[PDB]
């Protein structure tokens, strides 16, 4: 008759997990290499996916922490003394403008909350509430997008969470300054409904529930084959 | 309970291609509880584990401190243990597994292109 407090939904699902690692440069190059983008979802990290897909419906708040580490870049014309690096982190709600390049107008939109962060301080954090039209997120959706019974199968538009975009505020004239971003994601005030059997087959697609047939368990020698045995000894005489 | 304070002091390294102007050095300190993943190299995945509390510290501030509670399965630490690890009366003598406290791992957050910084 010992405690069960560690098996509750809160203590089971509120563990921070690293869900994205990206890199971006601070100088000339291909524009797509000068910013980092991520669409918020729980279907790309298999370890977190297996935990969220024990329940059919979920309702939680998001807490996102960004760890940013920058270093100098080898080449010619190295910077002898740089003041400090500042980074801009922008959260785009569902339906907001999304940048197609760095130094775009969407970076200065008043509907997108942004964080300006200087090197040396504590990691930046933000919290997003339960932002959806429906009354819950749904891990499994059996249905179509249009009512013609045709379209994308298994896609629901009621569980969009937005995007995260990170770039360098500074304009650098001497040298390049590569930076690396890590995203830590955590649910809070979690509520879950309608439990489901955990998955057996390995994941094959982030968008689908497709699978390969897998054996229901691990093989055994015989039906009456108990595990191994013990040799004769002082107790067994 | 354990209270641990870390004093970190950095200096430039002699050689060629000395850094003319570096912004600041940041250090990562990670405490690994008993049974958690332990890095086998720098820039490993265990450095980004969500079960290992970490401190990110910038040069110039006050020394970093952490406090660990009484983390053990039993009800006390034991300085002297007369017994074995296995019940076969064989194994390592004098070793108890009930007084593990974890590990501490420290590394440089920054990636340095010009010079070395011991």
């Amino acid at each position: 008759y010992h405690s069960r407090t560690e098996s509750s939904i809160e203590n089971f699902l509120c563990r921070a997990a690293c869900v994205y690692i990206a890199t971006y440069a601070s100088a000339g190059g291909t524009p797509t290499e000068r910013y980092a983008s991520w669409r918020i979802n729980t279907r790309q990290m298999v370890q977190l996916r297996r935990k969220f897909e024990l329940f059919t419906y979920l309702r939680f708040d998001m807490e996102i922490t960004f760890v940013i580490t920058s270093t100098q870049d080898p080449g010619t014309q190295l910077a002898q003394d740089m003041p400090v690096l500042t980074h801009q982190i922008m959260y785009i709600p569902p339906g907001g403008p999304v940048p197609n390049s760095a130094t775009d107008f969407a970076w200065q939109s008043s509907t997108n909350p942004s964080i300006f962060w200087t090197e040396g301080c504590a990691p930046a954090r933000m919290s997003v509430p339960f932002i959806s039209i429906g009354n819950a997120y749904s891990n499994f959706y059996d249905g179509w997008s249009h009512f013609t019974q045709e379209g994308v199968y298994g896609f629901n538009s009621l569980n969009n969470m937005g995007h995260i975009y990170v770039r360098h505020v500074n304009e650098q004239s001497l040298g390049v300054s590569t930076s690396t971003l890590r995203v830590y994601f955590k649910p809070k005030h979690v509520r879950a409904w309608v439990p489901r059997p955990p998955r057996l087959s390995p994941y094959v697609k982030s968008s689908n529930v497709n699978f390969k047939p897998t054996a229901v368990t691990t093989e055994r020698k015989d039906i009456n084959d108990v595990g191994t045995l013990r040799p004769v000894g002082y107790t067994n005489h | 309970d354990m209270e641990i304070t870390f004093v970190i002091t950095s200096t430039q390294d002699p050689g060629t291609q000395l850094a003319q102007d570096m912004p600041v050095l940041t250090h990562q300190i990670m405490y690994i509880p008993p049974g958690g993943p332990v890095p086998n190299s720098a820039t490993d995945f265990a450095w980004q584990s969500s079960t290992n509390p970490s401190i990110f510290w910038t040069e110039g501030c006050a020394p970093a401190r952490m406090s660990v509670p009484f983390i053990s399965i039993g009800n006390a630490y034991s300085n002297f243990y007369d017994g074995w690890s296995h019940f076969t009366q064989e194994g390592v003598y004098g070793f108890n597994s009930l007084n593990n406290m974890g590990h501490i791992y420290v590394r440089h957050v920054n990636e340095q292109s010009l010079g070395v910084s011991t």
Partner: antibody
Amino acid sequence: EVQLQQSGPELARPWASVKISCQAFYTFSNYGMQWVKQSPGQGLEWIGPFYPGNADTSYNQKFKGKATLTADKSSSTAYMQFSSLTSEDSAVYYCARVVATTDFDYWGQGTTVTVSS
Amino acid sequence: YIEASQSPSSLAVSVGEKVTMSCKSSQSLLYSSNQKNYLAWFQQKPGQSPKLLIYWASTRESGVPDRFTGSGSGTDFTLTISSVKAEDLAVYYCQQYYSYPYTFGGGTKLKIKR
């Protein structure tokens, strides 16, 4: 007239474990398995009995604290372990089996344990 | 019942040639807690009492000449003699003392080739 076999004679070394097995062709209910010591200098001396269906193992006082016995009834193989092995313990170990409480009916085949140091 | 199979035939080789033999066991003979292999290679002079060569498959019996070396881990069990002799005529078994019963091997005569 049932045959009887064993693990076999192997040239061992001093202080090296030598297990002398013994096959079976009977059941394991209230019967007995044991051995002897066949050395012309030392004559014949028993080493220890094993009793299937009784869970009893005994050793002689001449080897008590030195030798141990074990067996697996299902596997049909009986062990006779030995420790602190000497060089003069070499003998033609005979596997004796009794299907009765008090008798000696079937004898073994013969195995040698002579070593060279 | 747990038994073990020796080589299909005898050595049937010349005198003075190193011989290698194996004993195929029908089940595992390693106790993982102690890492001990419960099997021994036996030797019975015709007409006298038998006597093994090496017990535990890694500890040669005291008094046994250095020619016999027993090996083999897990189900397999082997033995090697770097100098076969004409006066070592016997029947070679690979007996197991792991669990009841203590079953013997299959037999191996030292025949004549000269």
